[PDB]
């Protein structure tokens, strides 16, 4: 049962059971404590002997999800400082050249961990894929921009994790030259950001973007504002030099206030006009710092970033219903609010009619959920695909359309429902997908992911602008569809960003 493998920092002891070797909490960066909250990830202090790698490490400091989300997305926090660790599932460390899937968890850059139960890599390892998950720094620590700290520590962490994979995964049976990085939303946005980041060069051959594209970045000037507000509220200077000393509970508290305020209508007196005007989607998304991330990933990708990387991308049909529906308040959303929302994008009120006409929302709240799904996820995803029309690498699209039965079906195919299907961890996701989700669909989706990691082809026609074909996953039927939601898609043709 014990299995000892050499990492670049020393031997680690995992566990091998029923054909799968599992290593949990392999350090890939020194604990980011104090000042090192904000420094670039440091290689773990080498050790002699054998470091235990049987238990997941500490996870990154995160605030609890808002109660609405947190009842559906139940996070597993692991206390401690040594959280820049990764986990490896391999069917056999001695294997030759296994596909490697590196999971970058989502969680809006403030939440998540690589070690969440639903992200268990065993189903991947069972299918002949080396699976790697890891924690990267989150929130203020990961991404608040500071003049005296490298920007985007969380992104640096992901790079360091992928470099660990590059440098170590052959010892776990993986082909470092067949790495598929994949992630959900913030994790997929991270992947897009990595595509756009010179420092991530060559660290992955393929990418699966589950509900995240290249739009999720903080303008440097906004990140500066955000750090200034954070620091002001903490009563310290907006510097790593100051923030290194703030108890993490206080950090997370102010981080949460920033998150909530940016998620709402930011007070211009506190946030300035840009941020009040919505210039920030996620306040701890990667900063367009200029050195690590030179431009928004979507623009980098439009210019060819990641065009050598095979791409599987998709969205959940009703993604944003997760953020509007679970508390039963969608019916209160008004047409005029939706109209005002559409107007923020320069769309007329009757754009809502197109949503209704395509079955994407009867009531304004439903339409709003679909609009936001489009604005933040589906259209950005499609823009990346469109950008890749001439990419040498392949592009495949999916739509995850299976609707969770939770809360009387009000969530539809909402955000995160696809995750246990990808991972075949449906029994760990019942808070979101209910008690009896179709394991067949988990098999279908997961196997497609494995096939894509293995060969760069998930097993269905490639995406192109001609037919815009995506695999629409659902149960009982997952089938190809072409040019889905063409009328709502066209609404966005000329929308800024
Ligand atoms: O609300 C979101 O869009 C931001 C626009 O304001 C949002 C963004 C990212 C995630 C995520 O990373 O989820 C990963 C799965 O746990 C979830 C939600
Ligand atoms: O989709 C997800 O990411 C996700 C969904 C649900 C859960 C969870 O705690 O379920 C517990 C019931 O088995 C965790 C993660």
Q: Which of 110, 114, 146 is nearest to 283 (CA)?
A: 110
Q: Which of 96, 59, 2, 60 is nearest to 12 (CA)?
A: 2
Q: Which of 428, 403, 407, 438 is nearest to 417 (CA)?
A: 403
Is the Cβ–Cβ distance between 38 and 149 less than 8 Å? yes
CA 59–ligand 2 middle distance (angstroms): 17
Phi-psi group of 101: left, alpha or beta (phi > 0 → left; psi -120 to 50 → alpha; rest → beta): beta
Write out the E strands in 249-308: 287-288
- Of 73, 75, 106, which is best to mutate to test ligand 1, by the most ligand atoms within 8 angstroms of its C-beta? 106
**Please, what is the angle between helix 335-344 and helix 364-372, to 10°?**
20
C-alpha 117/C-alpha 56 separation (Å) is 10
CATH topology of domain 310-491: Rossmann fold (3.40.50)
Residue 200 CB burial class (10 angstroms; 0-12, 13-18, ≥19): buried
186 ligand 2 Cβ < 6 A:
no
Q: Are strands 174-184 and 206-210 parallel, antiparallel or unpaired?
A: parallel
CA 89–ligand 2 middle distance (angstroms): 20
Write out the E strands in 158-307: 174-184, 206-210, 218-219, 287-288
Ligand 2 atom nearest residue 417's Cα:
1
Ligand nearest to the CA of 442: 2
3-state DSSP assignment of residue 150: coil
Q: Are strands 10-17 and 2-7 parallel, antiparallel or unpaired?
A: antiparallel
C-alpha 242/C-alpha 349 separation (Å) is 47
Which protein residues touch ligand 1 with a CB less than 6 Å away? 73, 106-108, 112, 184-186, 281-282, 323, 376, 415-416
Is the Cβ–Cβ distance between 161 and 193 less than 8 Å? no
CA 273–ligand 1 middle distance (angstroms): 23
Is the Cβ–Cβ distance between 463 and 469 less than 8 Å? yes
CA 431–ligand 2 middle distance (angstroms): 5
428 ligand 2 Cβ < 6 A:
yes
414 ligand 2 Cβ < 6 A:
no
C-alpha 490/C-alpha 496 separation (Å) is 14
Question: Is the fold of 2-218+287-302 the same as that of 310-491?
Answer: yes
Please name the method used to determine this structure: X-ray
Q: What is the CA radius of gyration of the chain?
A: 21
422 ligand 2 Cβ < 6 A:
no
Q: What residues have CB less than 8 Å from 80, skipping those under 6 apart?
A: 57, 58
C-alpha 197/C-alpha 286 separation (Å) is 11
C-alpha 487/C-alpha 497 separation (Å) is 19
Domain ranges of the chain: 2-218+287-302, 310-491
Is the Cβ–Cβ distance between 471 and 490 less than 8 Å? no
Atom 5 (ligand 1): residue with closest C-alpha? 281
121 ligand 2 Cβ < 6 A:
no
3-state DSSP assignment of residue 43: coil
Length of the chain: 497
CA 422–ligand 2 middle distance (angstroms): 13
Within 10 Å of residue 389's Cβ, how many Cβ atoms? 12
Record the tokens describing residue 108, joined without a space: 């809006």
Q: Which of 337, 327, 315, 497 is nearest to 417 (CA)?
A: 315
Resolution in A: 1.7
Which residues on neighbouring strands pair with residue 469, listed in sequence order?
482
- The CATH classification of domain 2-218+287-302, taken from the options 3.40.50.620, 1.10.274.100, 3.40.50.1820, 3.40.718.10: 3.40.50.1820
Is the Cβ–Cβ distance between 71 and 41 less than 8 Å? no
**Please, what is the angle between helix 153-168 and helix 186-195, to 10°?**
70
CA 419–ligand 1 middle distance (angstroms): 13
Is the Cβ–Cβ distance between 37 and 76 less than 8 Å? no
342 ligand 2 Cβ < 6 A:
no
Within 10 Å of residue 368's Cβ, how many Cβ atoms? 24
CA 476–ligand 1 middle distance (angstroms): 27
CA 51–ligand 2 middle distance (angstroms): 30
> Is the dihedral angle over the CA atoms 293, 296, 302, 307 positive or is it negative?
positive
Whole-angstrom distance between the N-terminal and C-terminal Cα of the chain? 52
73 ligand 2 Cβ < 6 A:
yes
**Please, what is the angle between helix 268-276 and helix 248-263, to 10°?**
60
């Amino acid at each position: 049962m014990e299995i000892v493998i050499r990492t670049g920092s020393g031997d680690v002891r995992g566990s091998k059971e029923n054909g799968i070797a599992v290593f949990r909490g392999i350090p890939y960066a020194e604990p980011p404590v104090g000042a090192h909250r904000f420094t670039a990830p440091r290689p773990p202090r080498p050790w002699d002997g054998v470091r235990d790698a049987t238990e997941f490490s500490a996870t990154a400091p995160r605030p609890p999800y808002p109660e609405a989300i947190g009842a559906l997305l139940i996070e597993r926090f692991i206390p401690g400082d040594d959280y820049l660790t990764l986990n490896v599932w391999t069917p056999d460390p001695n294997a030759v050249g296994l596909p490697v899937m590196v999971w970058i968890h989502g969680g809006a850059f403030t939440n998540g961990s690589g070690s969440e139960p639903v992200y268990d890599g065993a189903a991947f390892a069972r299918d002949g894929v080396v699976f790697v998950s890891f924690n990267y720094r989150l929130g203020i620590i990961g991404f608040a921009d500071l003049p005296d700290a490298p920007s985007n520590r969380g992104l640096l962490d992901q790079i360091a994790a992928l470099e660990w994979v590059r440098d170590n995964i052959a010892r776990f049976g993986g082909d470092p030259g067949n790495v598929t990085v994949f992630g959900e939303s913030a994790g997929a946005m991270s992947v897009c950001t990595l595509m756009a980041t010179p420092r991530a060069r060559g660290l992955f051959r393929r990418a699966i973007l589950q509900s995240g594209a290249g739009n999720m970045a903080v303008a440097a000037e906004d990140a500066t504002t955000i750090a200034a507000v954070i620091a002001h509220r903490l009563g310290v200077e907006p510097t790593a030099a100051a923030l290194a000393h703030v108890p993490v509970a206080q950090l997370l508290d102010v981080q949460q206030q920033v998150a909530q305020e940016i998620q709402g209508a930011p007070d211009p007196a506190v946030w300035g006009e840009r941020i009040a005007g919505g210039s920030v989607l996620l306040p701890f998304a990667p900063v367009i710092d200029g050195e690590l991330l030179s431009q928004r990933p979507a623009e980098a990708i439009a210019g060819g970033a990641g065009h050598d990387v095979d791409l599987l991308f998709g969205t959940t049909t009703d993604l944003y219903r997760l953020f509007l529906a679970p508390t039963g308040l969608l019916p209160f959303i008004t047409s005029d609010y939706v109209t005002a929302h559409l107007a923020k994008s320069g769309l007329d009120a009757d754009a809502a009619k197109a949503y209704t006409a395509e079955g994407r929302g009867e009531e304004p709240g439903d339409i709003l959920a679909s609009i936001i799904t489009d604005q933040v996820f589906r259209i950005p995803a499609l823009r990346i695909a469109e950008s890749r029309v001439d990419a040498p690498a392949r592009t495949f699209g999916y739509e995850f359309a299976w609707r969770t039965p939770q809360l009387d079906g009000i969530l539809g195919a909402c955000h995160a429902v696809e995750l246990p299907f990808v991972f075949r961890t449906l029994d760990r996701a019942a808070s979101l997908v209910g008690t009896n989700p179709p394991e067949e669909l988990a098999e279908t989706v997961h196997n497609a992911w494995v096939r894509f990691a293995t060969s760069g082809d998930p097993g269905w026609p490639a995406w192109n602008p001609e037919t815009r074909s995506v695999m629409r996953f659902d149960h009982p039927v997952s089938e190809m569809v072409t040019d889905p939601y063409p009328a709502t898609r066209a609404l966005w043709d000329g929308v800024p960003l």
